[PDB]
Design a protein around this ligand. Structure first.
Ligand SMILES: *C(/C=C\CCCCC)=C1/C(=O)C=C(SC[C@H](NC(=O)CC[C@H](N)C(=O)O)C(=O)NCC(=O)O)[C@@H]1C/C=C\CCCC(=O)O
Lengths: 274, 263
C-alpha cells in the first residue's frame, strides 16, 4: 500500500499538473471536448479551403496572429506567419512552465537556456498532438479547425511541414494520455542532461531521475491496464527528434525559396546551431 | 510471471553467448588487461596498420587485389565485411527470441533489415572505449586518434560512434542486460512495411518487462536505469540516419562486381 516515498512522487505530480494547467490556456481535455463535439458552444469554424479560409478571418479571430501584413499573394505564407508567431507564444508558455519544475531555476543559467533551446520543440509537437485528430488541427485557441487535407495542399514547400506532425499525432494520441500525464512527460523532456553543451549534467540527471520516477508511478496509477506504457511513452521521444530535424531541413529550404519572409529572432536563436 | 521473466532473460542470455563470440566481458577483460594474458596488436598509425595486416593477418576483407593500395578505403571496406558477419550473427540470435520465428516471414525480414544497424552500434560500444576500438575478434585495437587521422569523410565515420559509445557504456550494462536490450530493438513494431504489428508489440511488451526486471535485480543501485536505457534508442536512431548520410557522401569516392553484390 501507499509508501512514504511514493507519497513524495505524487505530490510532485500534483504540483506539475497544477503548474501545467496554470501555464497552458488550452489543455488536452478542452481540446478533446471541442473535437469530439460534446457541445453546441465549443464547435470550431472549419477551414478546408480558401473561401472557408476567407470566411475564417471573418468568422474567427487571428489578426494579432500574423502582424506584418495587409495580406500577401499567398495563403501558404500567411498561415506560416501564423503558426510561427504561435510557436513564439508556446515557447513563452513552455518557458513559464519550466520555471515551476523543482530545481530547474537553481541550475546554471547557461544550462537552463540550453535545456529550453532543445526541449522547446520536442515539447511543442507533443502538445500539438493534443489539438489534432487524423483529419486536422485546432487553431486560434480552439475557435477554428484547419483540415489536414487543406494543409497538405497549401503549396510545394509548405504542404510538407504538417504531415509529419499528424503522423506522430495519430500515433502518440493512440497512447491516450491525459493532461496529468503530459505534464510530467513534458518535465522529463526539458530535464534531459544529454543536451548538446550542458556544463553541469549530474544535477540535471538527478532531477530527471526523480521526474522519471514520478511519471512511472503516475502512468501505472492512471493506466493500470496499460502494460509498459511507460517504456512505450519514452520510445516516443525518438519520434520527436526526427520531427525536429525533418523540420529544420524544411526551414532551411524556406530561408532560400522565400528571401522576403521574416521569421522571428526567438525561433532563430532556438535554431541557431541546433 | 516474475519467474517467467527470469527464464526469458536467462534464455536470451544463454542464446546471446551462443551467437556472439566476443562478449562484453571478454571485450572488457581485454580492454582493461585482466585474465587475457595476450595483449592486442595496436594500430595507432600507418606502419601499425601495414604491420597489422600481417599479424592479426586480418586479411579477409583485403586479400582481394584491386584495393590493397589506398589505406583509408581498405579500412572502411574493413567495417563492411565485418558488419556483414555480425548481421548473420544478429539474425541467428533473433531466431532464438521466443515468438520471432512464428511471425510472418516478411515481417521477420523487415524487423531484421531495420534493426541490424542499431544492434551493430550497441554491440560496437561493447568493444570500444574513449581511446579506441577492438578489431578482428579482439586480436587488435585500432586507436581512436588514428581513425580521425583518416581524411575525407572517413575520419568522420567512427568518431560519432565513439561519442555514442562513451555515453552508452556509462550505463555499465553487461552481456546479461544487452541480450534482452537487443531483443527489444528487433521487436520494434514501428518498422515501416510491417504486416502484423500486434504480435511484434506483444513480444516486445513481454521483452520489456523482462528487461526492466533484469535491470532492477542486476543493478538495484542504478535508479531508473530502465528509463535511461530506453532514452538511448534516440541516440542509436540518429546515429544510424547519419551513418547513412556519410554512405551517401561516400559515393563521391571509390568502391568486385561480385564483391559489391555482397555488400
Ligand atoms: C506550427 C507548425 C509547426 C511548429 C513550428 C514551430 C517553429 C519552428 C503550428 C500550426 O501550423 C498550427 C498549430 S495550431 C496553433 C494554435 N493556434 C492556431 O492554430 C492559429 C494559427 C493561425 N491561424 C495560422 O496558422 O496562421 C494554438 O492553439 N497554439 C498554442 C499557442 O500558440 O500557444 C501549430 C502551433 C505550434 C505549437 C502549438 C503547441 C505547442 C504547445 O502548446 O506547447
Amino acid at each position: 500500500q501507499l509508501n512514504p516515498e511514493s507519497a513524495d512522487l505524487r505530490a510532485l505530480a500534483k504540483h506539475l499538473y497544477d503548474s501545467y494547467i496554470k501555464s497552458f490556456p488550452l489543455t488536452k481535455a478542452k481540446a478533446r471536448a471541442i473535437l469530439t463535439g460534446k457541445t453546441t458552444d465549443k464547435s470550431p469554424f472549419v477551414i478546408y479551403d480558401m473561401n472557408s479560409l476567407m470566411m475564417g478571418e471573418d468568422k474567427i479571430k487571428f489578426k494579432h496572429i500574423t502582424p506584418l501584413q495587409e495580406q500577401s499573394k499567398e495563403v501558404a505564407i500567411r498561415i506560416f506567419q501564423g503558426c510561427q508567431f504561435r510557436s513564439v507564444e508556446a515557447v513563452q508558455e513552455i518557458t513559464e512552465y519550466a520555471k515551476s519544475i523543482p530545481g530547474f531555476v537553481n541550475l546554471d543559467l547557461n544550462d537552463q537556456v540550453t535545456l529550453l533551446k532543445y526541449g522547446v520543440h520536442e515539447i511543442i509537437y507533443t502538445m500539438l498532438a493534443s489539438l489534432m485528430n487524423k483529419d486536422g488541427v485546432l487553431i486560434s485557441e480552439g475557435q477554428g479547425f484547419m483540415t489536414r487535407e487543406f494543409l497538405k495542399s497549401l503549396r510545394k514547400p509548405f504542404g510538407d511541414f504538417m504531415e509529419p506532425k499528424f503522423e506522430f499525432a495519430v500515433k502518440f494520441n493512440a497512447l491516450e494520455l491525459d493532461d496529468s500525464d503530459l505534464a510530467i512527460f513534458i518535465a522529463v523532456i526539458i530535464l534531459s542532461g544529454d543536451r548538446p553543451g550542458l556544463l553541469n549534467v549530474k544535477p540535471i540527471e538527478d532531477i530527471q531521475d526523480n521526474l522519471l520516477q514520478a511519471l512511472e508511478l503516475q502512468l501505472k496509477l492512471n493506466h493500470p491496464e496499460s502494460s509498459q506504457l511507460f517504456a512505450k511513452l519514452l520510445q516516443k521521444m525518438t519520434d520527436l527528434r526526427q520531427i525536429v530535424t525533418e523540420h529544420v531541413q524544411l526551414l532551411q529550404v524556406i530561408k532560400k525559396t522565400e528571401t522576403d519572409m521574416s521569421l522571428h529572432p526567438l525561433l532563430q536563436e532556438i535554431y541557431k546551431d541546433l
